[PDB]
Design a protein around this ligand. Sequence first.
Ligand SMILES: C[C@@H](c1ccccn1)N1C[C@H](CO)[C@H]2CCC[C@@H](C1=O)N2S(=O)(=O)c1cc(Cl)cc(Cl)c1
Length: 163
Amino acid sequence: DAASHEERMNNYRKRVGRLFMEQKAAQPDAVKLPSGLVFQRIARGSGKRAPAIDDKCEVHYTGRLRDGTVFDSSRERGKPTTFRPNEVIKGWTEALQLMREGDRWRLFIPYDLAYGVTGGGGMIPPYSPLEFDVELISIKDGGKGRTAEEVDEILRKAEEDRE
Ligand SMILES: C[C@@H](c1ccccn1)N1C[C@H](CO)[C@H]2CCC[C@@H](C1=O)N2S(=O)(=O)c1cc(Cl)cc(Cl)c1
């Protein structure tokens, strides 16, 4: 019945999403944080501060589903896409606060740090991990969050803690 089929499909989505996240975490240069957020660095920026929770950030991004299909991007929006960490999904909240201006990272966000069991916007199904290419162009008024030194402490610990 439709209700048992819904349960089966959500168990399927949960299982294959977990597989995706384990594969991305296993990449030789991927870094996994305690929350389950995984990232690969693409470029290192020259900025010296990360944004605070409420700093306005201009981000150039592309979002992909776990099959690789692009579902959103700055390019499609036309105008500059700006966000505060406290406005966005938890995986972005966490990543932005560990990025400085000019950083470009590939994020692999487990479903519980994205849209969870609900999904979103009619194109992100329940239980989806998400992949993003994120470049932090600028933080309005410079950045009031972590210093580069503090960011480096956190990210070095996560590299060193790799299982
Ligand atoms: C602000 C927040 C949000 C979510 C749901 C309702 C209202 N606001 N939000 C959306 C922004 C786009 O404004 C975008 C980029 C930042 C991360 C994430 C995000 O946290 N997504 S997204 O790429 O995952 C995404 C999700 C959906 Cl539902 C649809 C699309 Cl087209 C793209």
